Amino acid sequence: QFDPDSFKNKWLELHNNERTTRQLDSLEWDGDLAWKAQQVATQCNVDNPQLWGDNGASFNIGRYTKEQAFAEWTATSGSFPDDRSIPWQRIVANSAQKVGCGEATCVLEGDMAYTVNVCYYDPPLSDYYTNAGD
């Protein structure tokens, strides 16, 4: 029960609204990332996911609906440029060109299931100066 076309659209809109406000170039969807995202998402592990590749940690992860998950990431803007803002940094980085997101439905024993959301970014986040470079 899944509409891929609308799924890409919603995620792109969330990301690109945030960036458009801030005079940034929009991100384009990349399926490879979206696939990677799903791989991570499927594990049902927010804290300790098993990752692979050079850009393996270049991603955001969050619980519940898309809007809620995205907001929890952008909510960290407050403390930029410290490490707590890294989530928001991924979204807003000037160097960033591509995103791909993926989900999975995970359970709490004898409780309502919840969604796990993951988005991957390319190129990966670097140092403070590089991220704002064009």
Residue numbers in the entry: 31 to 164
Sentences from the paper on this structure:
We present in this report the structure of MpPR-1i, a SCP/TAPS protein expressed by M. perniciosa during biotrophic stage of WBD, in basidiomes, and in monokaryotic mycelia. MpPR-1 proteins are homologues of plant pathogenesis–related-1 (PR-1) proteins that were first identified over a century ago as important for defense against fungi and parasites. PR-1 proteins are members of the eukaryotic CAP (cysteine-rich secretory protein/antigen 5/pathogenesis related-1) or SCP/TAPS (Sperm-coating protein/Tpx/antigen 5/pathogenesis related-1/Sc7) superfamily of proteins, which has been implicated in biological processes like reproduction, fungal virulence, cellular defense, and immune evasion. Each monomer of MpPR-1i has a conserved alpha-beta-alpha sandwich topology made up of 3 β strands sandwiched between two helical domains, connected by loops.
There are seven monomers in the asymmetric unit, which form a pseudo seven fold screw axis when viewed along the diagonal of the cell. The MpPR-1i crystal has very high solvent content, ~70%, which is clearly demonstrated by the solvent channel in the crystal packing viewed along a cell dimension. The most variable regions between the monomers are loop regions, notably the solvent exposed loop connecting the two longest β-stands, as well as the N- and C-termini loops. MpPR-1i forms a unique crystallographic heptamer, which likely does not have any functional relevance as MpPR-1i forms monomers in solution. MpPR-1i, like SmVAL4, lacks the tetrad that binds divalent cations in other SCP/TAPS proteins. Structural comparisons with tablysin-15, a palmitate binding CAP protein, showed that MpPR-1i has a similar cavity sufficiently large and open to accommodate palmitate or similar lipids. The shortened length of the CBM loop significantly reduces the size of the sterol binding cavity, rendering it barely large enough to accommodate dioxane and definitely too small to accommodate cholesterol.
